[PDB]
Coordinates of C-alpha atoms (C1' of nucleotides) in Angstrom, one line a residue:
Chain M
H12 CA 116.1 72.3 58.3
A13 CA 114.9 75.2 56.2
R14 CA 111.4 76.3 54.9
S15 CA 110.5 78.9 52.3
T16 CA 106.8 78.2 52.0
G17 CA 104.8 75.1 53.0
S18 CA 101.9 73.9 55.1
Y19 CA 99.8 76.2 57.2
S20 CA 97.8 75.4 60.3
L21 CA 94.1 75.2 60.1
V22 CA 92.5 77.2 62.9
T23 CA 95.0 80.1 62.9
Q24 CA 96.5 80.0 59.4
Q25 CA 100.1 80.0 60.7
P26 CA 102.9 77.8 59.6
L27 CA 103.3 74.5 61.5
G28 CA 106.4 73.6 63.5
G29 CA 108.9 70.8 63.3
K30 CA 111.2 69.4 60.7
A31 CA 109.0 66.3 60.4
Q32 CA 106.1 68.3 59.0
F33 CA 108.2 70.9 57.2
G34 CA 107.4 73.7 59.7
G35 CA 108.8 77.2 60.0
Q36 CA 110.9 78.5 62.9
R37 CA 109.1 80.0 65.9
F38 CA 109.7 83.8 66.1
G39 CA 109.1 84.0 69.9
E40 CA 108.2 87.1 71.9
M41 CA 111.7 87.6 73.1
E42 CA 113.0 88.1 69.6
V43 CA 110.0 90.5 68.9
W44 CA 111.3 92.4 71.9
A45 CA 114.8 92.4 70.5
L46 CA 113.6 93.7 67.1
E47 CA 111.5 96.5 68.7
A48 CA 114.5 97.4 70.8
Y49 CA 116.5 97.7 67.6
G50 CA 113.8 99.9 66.1
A51 CA 113.4 97.8 62.9
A52 CA 109.7 98.3 62.5
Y53 CA 109.5 97.1 58.9
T54 CA 111.3 93.8 59.7
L55 CA 108.8 93.3 62.5
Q56 CA 105.9 94.1 60.2
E57 CA 106.9 91.5 57.7
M58 CA 107.7 89.0 60.4
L59 CA 104.1 89.4 61.8
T60 CA 102.0 89.9 58.7
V61 CA 103.4 88.6 55.3
Chain X
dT2 C1' 91.3 93.5 113.6
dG3 C1' 92.7 89.0 113.0
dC4 C1' 91.0 84.9 110.9
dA5 C1' 90.7 81.6 107.1
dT6 C1' 89.8 81.5 102.1
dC7 C1' 90.3 82.1 97.2
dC8 C1' 92.8 83.6 93.2
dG9 C1' 96.6 84.2 89.6
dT10 C1' 101.6 83.4 88.9
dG11 C1' 105.8 80.6 87.6
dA12 C1' 111.0 79.7 79.8
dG13 C1' 113.5 78.7 76.2
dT14 C1' 114.1 76.4 71.4
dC15 C1' 113.5 71.4 70.5
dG16 C1' 112.0 64.8 69.0
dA17 C1' 108.6 60.6 68.7
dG18 C1' 105.2 58.2 69.1
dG19 C1' 100.1 59.1 69.3
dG20 C1' 96.2 56.6 70.3
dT21 C1' 92.0 53.7 74.3
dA22 C1' 87.0 52.4 76.2
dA23 C1' 82.6 50.1 82.4
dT24 C1' 77.7 49.3 79.4
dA25 C1' 72.9 49.0 76.7
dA26 C1' 66.1 45.3 73.5
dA27 C1' 63.7 44.5 70.7
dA28 C1' 59.1 44.2 67.5
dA29 C1' 55.8 46.8 64.6
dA30 C1' 54.2 50.4 61.4
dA31 C1' 55.2 54.6 59.1
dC32 C1' 57.5 57.6 56.5
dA33 C1' 61.4 59.7 53.9
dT34 C1' 64.7 59.3 50.4
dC35 C1' 68.3 57.8 47.3
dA36 C1' 69.3 54.7 43.7
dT37 C1' 68.8 52.9 38.9
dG38 C1' 66.6 52.8 34.4
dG39 C1' 64.3 54.5 30.6
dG40 C1' 62.8 58.4 27.8
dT41 C1' 62.6 63.5 25.7
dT42 C1' 65.9 68.0 24.8
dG43 C1' 69.7 69.6 23.2
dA44 C1' 74.2 70.3 22.3
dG45 C1' 77.2 69.3 20.3
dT46 C1' 81.3 67.6 17.2
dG47 C1' 81.4 65.5 12.1
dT48 C1' 81.5 65.8 7.0
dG49 C1' 80.7 66.8 2.8
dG50 C1' 79.7 70.5 -0.5
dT51 C1' 80.2 75.4 -4.3
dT52 C1' 83.2 79.4 -5.4
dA53 C1' 87.1 83.1 -4.5
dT54 C1' 91.3 82.1 -6.7
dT55 C1' 97.3 83.1 -8.1
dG56 C1' 101.7 80.7 -10.0
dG57 C1' 102.8 77.8 -14.2
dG58 C1' 103.0 76.4 -18.9
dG59 C1' 101.8 77.2 -22.7
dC60 C1' 101.4 79.3 -28.6
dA61 C1' 101.6 84.1 -31.1
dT62 C1' 104.1 87.6 -32.7
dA63 C1' 108.0 89.4 -33.0
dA64 C1' 113.3 89.5 -33.1
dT65 C1' 119.4 88.5 -33.7
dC66 C1' 122.6 85.5 -34.8
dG67 C1' 124.7 81.5 -38.2
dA68 C1' 126.1 79.3 -42.7
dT69 C1' 127.2 80.6 -49.0
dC70 C1' 126.3 82.4 -54.7
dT71 C1' 125.7 87.1 -57.3
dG72 C1' 127.5 92.4 -58.0
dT73 C1' 131.7 96.3 -57.9
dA74 C1' 137.8 98.5 -58.8

DNA sequence: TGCATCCGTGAGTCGAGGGTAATAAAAAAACATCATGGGTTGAGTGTGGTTATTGGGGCATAATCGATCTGTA
């Protein structure tokens, strides 16, 4: 599976999940912790906003 | 101070079907409202019409060859 840009959820405007509905991968909170441990603030900013 | 009592907590990506149902009353009048159909505005898109032409061919008016019988050592 892979997704560049597709459907977005309705209430919260976030990408859906699952290969069946062509959903994006879930960037959980553990990986957010890992990124802020690295110090890569810009990668986090794009991962949370754009 | 000891007792019961209440109040948060407790993972992670993932897939596939994905929706089901105990019951109930009719009249009448009254009103609201959309639905269609026919008629004015009006808003177009449609179609011919006069008048600006600029290359082209044309006839004038000139011009430079091509062919033979009279004058000079």
